[PDB]
């Protein structure tokens, strides 16, 4: 994470696909280095099929330049997330910020 | 390979990777090796330096001594663009270049 | 050749009808294998590991 | 015609941190022992730290235990800093076991008479699914300075245990050193000086223990410095091998069956310089060798070009 | 570059500093003078030279 | 604004401090700047070039 | 746990007074540490005997002139520091310069005392011009560890006790067969002749060892 930043780093991280960003706000039911399950809040949740949003994370895998591209969970168990929150960092991203 | 510094050099020398020098002088080592009898035959020598037996390094330093190499950098503009140095062995994959040159 | 032949006869190696072509790790690079994939022609029998 | 210093108050101020002071110091020796101690304290000090680790259902650093929120590569990197201290032993294999939705700290290990977990709050990883469960063989040795993982394979010769993840070894308990000599007058002496050597441990070296084994090295080094015998080595080794070198390799290399492999363990035969000279006579009379058992040995000796039973009026010469 | 900033800073003088005005047998004890913190690298000094 | 934030950290405005050479242990004449700079390793890594 | 102590150490000496000792293979950083630390003791805190005070025959001040001498008062003072003195059982001896006449005053031209040993009677002290030109003075040697300036005497000559005229340590890389980077330590030293470079170091290191008599086991 840059000690000295400009502010864009949150913008670049998110809009770039590498990070895993919450579709719908809710609470974390389960956190694994593999996946993350979000029990959706009532308001945003569609009437039928109910259910939860489940983000399956990308694990250690080859990039175009032979660098490694790996996602990690940035939330802990039973934490509140709102829509558009950072759920898991990509490579060279920290806590939602772009860290090259 | 990439070049780095090395102020510890005398002006008439340069830092050449263990790894590179091994591959560069390969026929030379094969030579000094069966000369001093540490290898039965060239095919053995091949297997020895392939093995990177520690014995060979002391040999490499023999074959290296009064044996200049040529260093040359990107756009060769005047004759000083190629220059000859006496090689000094280095751990690392970079070349060490005397700062004055 | 002659001298190769005498050599096989002194030390008894069964000079094969097959060449060594295996995929080997490139000089100088070293790491941990983390995945193996096998892709097979439609209609050739899948070997053991595959 | 000189003085000599000694150490008055050693003042702890944290498990981690302490100021040891050295009073009777002459003009300038302050900075002299002072810099040269920082130098031998930041490097050359003894330390134990986790070296290898096998974990339950994992094959290499780049995988994922089910039901943990770290990845194996991260869990290793938590142990690198696991601060342990042990005594009579040199390498001790601690064991870790715990299940259920709950932070697995360093305290969750099992204790040995020598094991002192100098920080039991130390996070190792978090479980996260009721009956998710981990177990591991953490291995600690104790050496000097920085043996990174990589250099710890040239000894290879069957470290095959796929499970064993080697971690880079950070063997040292100095974090950061800082001396400052403020001037100190013992009541009468024109001007002598103090030497406060402030230091920062991981918790597993007691200041006095350190600063002593520090000064110790300096002595043994300066030992050779005192007189100078121009000393050298004999050199010029031998270029005359009698036999074929093949006879100086162990019987493993024969790539043989296990019942025939241990059996040459038995009858006192390591190197093939001994198998070469024991006839077929010698072999039914050896514990557990037969038609299928010895047919095997006449065929791997055939392939490499040797035979069973011959002589050599000179075995083995000579160092 | 590095190396000339080097000699320059060395063989450059300031108005008043340690070693001001003393006199020395030769260069040898001039280094001795500096390494030991008695003299400033750059201080005006008469010395015996040959 | 930078200097003001240096006060709170209780660090000098120079942005500079004195340092001591780890080898000889002695002071560096002059303040040198120290601080924290975000730095990248670009992928022209040597053991790909050699 | 256990350590590395060096092998192959060749002192190659140029002249008896000057000498260059190389010493490998030290563990990493141990060249600088032994090197700098031995340098500090070789230069600063090394017992020696040099000229400390001078009362002159003819004139009172360090800004005056002697008749028959082209060397200024500040000049001969410099020459004095460069005389190499060694006392035997005596802690303090003082000599008389009785010599006069047309020509240069060497050190064999000094009074020869029992516990006095001049390492160079060849040494040039000052010159004498024509005619008679009278010169005899009393010059007091003192004993100390170090280099003591005239300025540090508040209640006069700079006292250069230590035998070291110059010291430098140069640290370069040495390999042990399968160790990559160890240090090779090169010490180069010049002396005033009262003691040879080789021995200078011995006691130089001995001193530092003596200081650890409190921690080692």
């Amino acid at each position: 994470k840059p000690l000295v930043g400009t502010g864009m780093e949150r913008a670049v991280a998110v809009d770039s696909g590498v990070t895993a960003v919450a579709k719908r706000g809710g609470v974390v039911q389960y956190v694994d280095a593999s996946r993350i399950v979000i029990k959706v809040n009532e308001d945003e949740m569609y009437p039928g099929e109910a259910g939860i949003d489940i983000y399956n994370l990308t694990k250690y895998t080859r990039s175009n330049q032979n660098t490694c591209i790996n996602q990690m969970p940035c939330v802990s168990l039973g934490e509140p997330v709102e829509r558009g929150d950072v759920l898991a960092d990509g490579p060279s991203t920290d806590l939602g910020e772009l860290a090259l | 390979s990439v070049i780095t510094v090395g102020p510890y050099l005398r002006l008439h020398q340069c830092g050449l990777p263990k790894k590179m020098a091994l591959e560069l002088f390969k026929p030379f080592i094969y030579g000094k090796l069966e000369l001093r009898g540490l290898a039965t035959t060239i095919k053995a020598a091949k297997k020895m330096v392939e093995r990177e037996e520690a014995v060979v390094w002391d040999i490499l330093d023999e074959v290296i001594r009064e044996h200049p190499v040529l260093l040359n950098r990107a756009p060769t503009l005047h004759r000083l663009g190629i220059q000859a140095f006496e090689p000094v062995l280095i751990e690392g994959k970079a070349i060490q270049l005397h700062p004055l040159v | 050749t002659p001298e190769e032949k005498l050599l096989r006869a002194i030390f008894g190696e069964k000079a094969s009808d097959v060449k060594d072509s295996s995929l080997r790790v490139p000089n100088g690079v070293s790491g941990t294998v983390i995945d193996v994939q096998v892709f097979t022609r439609d209609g050739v029998e899948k070997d053991k590991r595959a | 015609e000189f003085l000599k210093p000694r150490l008055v108050d050693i003042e702890q101020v944290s498990s981690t941190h302490a100021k040891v002071t050295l009073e009777p110091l002459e003009r300038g020796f302050g900075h002299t022992l002072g810099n040269a101690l920082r130098r031998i304290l930041l490097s050359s000090m003894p330390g134990c730290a986790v070296t290898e680790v096998e974990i339950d259902g994992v094959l290499h650093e780049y995988s994922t235990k089910e039901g943990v929120q770290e990845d194996i590569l991260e869990i290793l990197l938590n142990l690198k800093g696991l601060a342990v201290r042990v005594q009579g032993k040199d390498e001790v294999i601690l064991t870790l076991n715990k299940s259920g939705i709950g932070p697995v700290t360093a305290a969750d290990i099992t204790h040995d008479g020598d094991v002192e977990i100098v920080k039991p709050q130390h996070v190792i990883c978090h479980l996260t699914d009721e009956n998710a469960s981990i177990s591991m063989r953490i291995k600690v040795q104790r050496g000097r300075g920085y043996v990174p993982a990589s250099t710890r394979i040239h000894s290879e010769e069957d470290e095959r245990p796929i499970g064993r993840l080697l971690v880079d070894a950070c063997y040292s308990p100095v974090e950061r050193i800082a001396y400052n000599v403020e001037a100190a007058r013992v009541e009468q002496r024109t001007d002598l000086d103090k030497l406060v050597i402030e230091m920062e441990t991981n918790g597993t070296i007691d200041p006095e223990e350190a600063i002593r084994r520090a000064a110790t090295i300096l002595a043994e080094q300066l030992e050779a410095f005192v007189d100078l015998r121009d000393v050298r080595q004999p050199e010029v080794k031998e270029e005359k091998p009698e036999f074929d070198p093949i006879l100086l390799r162990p019987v493993d290399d024969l790539e043989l069956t296990v019942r025939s492999a241990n059996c040459l363990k038995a009858e006192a035969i390591h190197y093939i310089g001994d198998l070469v000279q024991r006839t077929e006579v010698e072999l039914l009379k050896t514990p557990n060798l037969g038609k299928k058992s010895l047919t095997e040995i006449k065929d791997v000796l055939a392939s490499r070009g040797l035979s069973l039973g011959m002589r050599l009026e000179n075995w083995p010469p000579a160092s | 570059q590095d190396v000339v900033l080097g000699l320059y800073y060395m063989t450059r003088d300031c108005v008043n500093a340690k070693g001001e005005g003393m006199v020395l047998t030769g260069p040898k004890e001039a280094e001795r003078l500096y390494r030991s913190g008695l003299a400033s690298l750059h201080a005006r000094v008469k010395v015996r030279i040959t | 604004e930078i200097k003001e934030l240096l006060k709170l950290g209780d660090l000098p405005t120079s942005g500079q401090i004195r340092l001591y050479d780890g080898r000889t242990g002695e002071q560096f004449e002059r303040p040198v700047t120290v601080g924290y700079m975000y730095m990248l390793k670009l992928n022209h890594l040597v053991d790909d070039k050699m």
Side-chain angles (χ1 to χ4, degrees), chain D residues 204-305:
Chain D
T204 59
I205 265 315
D206 273 281
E208 200 181 0
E209 168 90 322
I211 192 74
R212 178 155 312 247
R213 188 142 51 188
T216 314
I217 340 191
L218 204 78
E220 293 166 338
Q221 236 34 267
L222 279 144
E223 205 179 5
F225 247 151
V226 180
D227 47 36
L228 299 102
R229 263 105 190 266
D230 294 33
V231 70
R232 61 165 196 288
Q233 222 62 247
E235 198 51 31
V236 288
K237 296 90 66 263
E238 77 212 340
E239 343 274 341
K240 50 262 198 311
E242 303 64 33
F243 56 92
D244 176 317
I246 268 286
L247 282 81
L248 272 190
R249 277 208 213 118
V251 283
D252 280 62
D253 296 61
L254 301 160
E255 301 173 21
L256 7 65
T257 183
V258 209
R259 186 179 283 268
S260 298
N262 283 68
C263 196
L264 278 175
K265 182 186 188 78
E267 214 87 340
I269 292 163
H270 302 45
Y271 311 159
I272 68 111
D274 258 83
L275 170 49
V276 89
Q277 43 175 5
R278 234 100 192 68
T279 158
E280 301 210 37
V281 195
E282 307 303 301
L283 301 182
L284 173 52
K285 323 303 146 187
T286 298
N288 260 348
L289 257 169
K291 168 179 295 313
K292 312 267 190 190
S293 309
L294 208 262
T295 303
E296 149 97 38
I297 310 304
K298 289 179 277 191
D299 291 317
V300 265
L301 249 58
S303 75
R304 277 297 95 189

Side-chain angles (χ1 to χ4, degrees), chain D residues 152-167:
Chain D
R152 311 204 307 101
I153 173 194
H154 198 106
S155 49
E156 230 179 11
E157 285 171 338
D158 258 313
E159 91 145 65
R160 200 275 331 143
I162 28 168
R164 293 282 172 169
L165 286 324
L166 312 107
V167 298

